[PDB]
Design a protein around this ligand. Structure first.
Ligand SMILES: [Hg+2]
Ligand SMILES: [Hg+2]
Ligand SMILES: [Hg+2]
Length: 701
């Protein structure tokens, strides 16, 4: 069911200061919208339009901390939020146009250099206010770029203004012919009506000439800018079952369509479930099929952004095109990928993904065995480390503001609050805003709170089993084997599992004397940890299911194919010339998910060995390989939550030729690099070469 997982990235996580030191504020005489644009230098720039549409913010995706974020203040809000705003890169510059509320037409010119410089000053004219047309009468609501000098304006009443640049700073309104207003001669529409309007809600420029548009009544009017004449006028709805009942005339500009080559998909309102996709050809738009959506619980999701593109590397080869869809329902999000098999838009499959990160799911479902327990300040370090300074401090802000102050060092009552706020602030910071296709195929989501992004990563085999235990109808032997192993381990409690994990570490550390026989240690672990701690009924279920497996074969594939990665004859992981903060955290978080998953599997398998009579001699190899993998897994997970920055540092300064970071462009490269870091973790030495190293480990582990 779910083929992608969520990796949350907070670009300032590794730092104490929850804000770059280099922040410049330009004034003219972001939690409502955010997106990422690629530039000439192959760098990614992020921008956020504040809630009030009065502030625009810029910062580099790959260097959020040391890089410069630029806050561009504005005289007043734009007319209609980010819809009356545009940002394209002309020639070595970020050209920003923004029809303001008053009716002005601000023009921002930000030098590509300035964006990556150290400069806290800007020379010349980076902005030009202008009053082309009078918007006091016919108020506009949607600005649309087309070219450096030409771009249209969409009006609330339905009219399309033109806007041609003559010199390099002045714009003149080149009006298009419009007779759609004559429908007022009907007893069904009045020009003076607050309704009746059929304004554009989506628009896409095709072959630099045709301007495909979508009205609130889902009419696909196609404009030819060579004629400035309405060339087509299709009625998207008539084709599907004509429901007299109710058709939700789109009541707001949104992302209802996007086109790849000559294919075009459209989102029609039918319980919020229609994705029509025909093809343009010559100009002619021609139907193909209506693909419903698989949404339930009333179907209360709103489209956030959709992106039609070249296929991906999903679990089904039968692919032609891919539609990445981002829905939202409050601060909760949903990302899916519509995979169309053949050129006939009639055979397709809906691919879903996990919408909470593993770190989030483990916290929610009390599935975390690694994080140290105890003290109240211990729980403070845990959260602070877990959330990052930007969020932690924002939560301690909301606490005092609400008069929730820490009584004493051990005010557990307090910490209990922090938990919930942190969780909520994160959820808030994480509200979905748009999609950015990082590289060639990396699905990325940009959040409401600046410096927070979410990468949706294609799952590896093992990950898929993990994320689909309660679903895979079919699945391989190993899948079925792991599932039944989980079936039993899930019935135990955290305190029991932790006590067991600790015992496995003692075998490696020696607290469980090397003098003992394997059977003796497993005996010790059982009596001290498992006895009287589980339902004998469940052991039977486990014992039974286990007998249907060729255990040796299965464990061999798990331990020698799935878990233990492979040797590298350097399989190209673009060596980064400069520190890439984005991929850094994306890599560390990904590495942490994979090892966490490995850790649960490993523990579960080890568990069966201390419960049943498996020849400690036959499986002697496997048992010691698992105990060794478990130890490394634990340690790594332990260092991850003890100090993310330091870990990333020692972990990236471990690889020689990749001492600065990496640059991955597709999912394969990404997965490869992660699997790569995994090897560094499984091949690392864990022998303490002196009392110094032993102290270190004892003190930390
Ligand atoms: Hg799957
Ligand atoms: Hg997000
Ligand atoms: Hg770091």
């Amino acid at each position: 069911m779910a083929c992608l997982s969520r990796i949350d990235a907070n670009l300032l996580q590794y730092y104490e200061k929850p804000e770059p030191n280099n922040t410049v504020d330009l004034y003219v005489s972001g939690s409502e919208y955010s997106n990422c644009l690629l530039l000439s230098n192959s760098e990614y720039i992020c921008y956020h339009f504040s809630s009030r549409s009065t502030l625009l913010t810029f910062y580099p995706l790959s260097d959020a901390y040391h890089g410069k974020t630029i806050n561009i203040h504005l005289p007043n809000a734009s007319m209609n939020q980010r819809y009356t705003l545009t940002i394209q890169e002309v020639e070595q510059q970020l050209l920003v146009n923004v029809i303001l509320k008053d009716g002005s037409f601000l023009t921002l010119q930000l030098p590509l250099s300035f964006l990556f410089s150290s400069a806290n000053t800007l020379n010349g004219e980076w902005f030009h206010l202008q009053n082309p047309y009078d918007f006091t009468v016919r108020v506009p609501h949607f600005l649309f770029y087309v070219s450096p000098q030409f771009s249209v304006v969409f009006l609330e009443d339905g009219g399309l203004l033109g806007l041609k640049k003559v010199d390099g700073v002045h714009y003149e309104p080149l009006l298009f012919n419009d007779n759609s207003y004559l429908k007022c001669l009907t007893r069904f529409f009045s020009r003076s009506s607050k309704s009746d309007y059929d304004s554009v809600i989506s628009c896409k420029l095709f072959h630099e000439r045709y301007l495909i548009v979508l009205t609130q009544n889902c009419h696909l009017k196609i404009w030819d800018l060579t004629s400035f004449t309405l060339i087509q006028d299709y009625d998207m709805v008539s084709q599907s079952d004509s429901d007299p009942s109710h058709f939700r005339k789109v009541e707001a500009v949104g992302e209802y369509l996007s086109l790849y080559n000559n294919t075009l998909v459209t989102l029609l309102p039918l319980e919020n479930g229609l994705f029509q996709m025909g093809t343009l050809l010559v100009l002619t738009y021609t139907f193909q099929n209506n693909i419903p959506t698989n949404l339930s619980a009333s179907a209360i999701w709103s489209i956030v952004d959709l992106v039609l593109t070249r296929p991906l590397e999903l679990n089904v080869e039968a692919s032609y095109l891919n539609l990445i869809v981002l829905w939202k329902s409050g601060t909760a999000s949903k990302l899916q990928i519509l995979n169309v098999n053949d050129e006939s838009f009639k055979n397709y499959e809906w691919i879903e993904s996990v919408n909470k990160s593993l770190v989030d799911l483990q916290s929610e479902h009390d599935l975390d065995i690694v994080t140290k327990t105890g003290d109240v300040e211990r729980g403070f370090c845990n959260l602070k480390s877990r959330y990052g300074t930007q969020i932690f401090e924002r939560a301690q802000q909301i606490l005092s503001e609400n008069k929730i102050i820490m009584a004493h060092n051990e005010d557990e009552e307090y910490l209990a609050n922090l938990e919930t706020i942190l969780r909520d602030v994160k959820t808030a910071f994480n509200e979905a805003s748009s999609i950015t296709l990082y590289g060639d195929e990396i699905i990325l989501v940009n959040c409401f709170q600046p410096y927070n992004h979410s990468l949706y990563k294609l799952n590896t085999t093992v990950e898929n089993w993990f994320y689909n235990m309660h679903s895979e109808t079919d699945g391989s032997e190993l899948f079925k084997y792991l599932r039944t192993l989980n079936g039993f381990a899930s019935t135990l409690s955290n305190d029991v599992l932790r006590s067991i994990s600790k015992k496995f570490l003692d075998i490696i550390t020696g607290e469980l004397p090397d003098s003992m026989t394997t059977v003796e240690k497993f005996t010790d672990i059982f009596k001290n940890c498992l006895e009287n701690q589980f339902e004998i009924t469940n052991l039977k279920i486990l014992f039974d299911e286990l007998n249907s497996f060729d255990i040796p074969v299965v464990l061999n594939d798990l331990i020698n194919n799935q878990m233990k990665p492979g040797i590298f004859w350097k399989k190209d992981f673009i060596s980064a010339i400069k520190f890439d903060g984005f991929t850094s955290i994306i890599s560390l978080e990904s590495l942490h998910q994979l090892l966490s998953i490995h850790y649960r599997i490993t523990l579960q398998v080890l568990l069966t060995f201390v419960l049943f009579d498996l020849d400690t001699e036959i499986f002697g190899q496997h048992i010691s390989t698992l105990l060794d993998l478990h130890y490394k897994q634990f340690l790594l997970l332990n260092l991850y939550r003890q100090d993310k920055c330091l870990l990333a540092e020692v972990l990236l300064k471990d690889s020689s030729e990749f001492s600065f970071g990496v640059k991955f462009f597709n999912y394969g490269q990404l997965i490869a690099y992660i699997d790569s870091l995994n090897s560094n973790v499984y091949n690392a030495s864990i022998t303490e070469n002196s009392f110094f190293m032993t102290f270190f480990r004892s003190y930390i582990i």
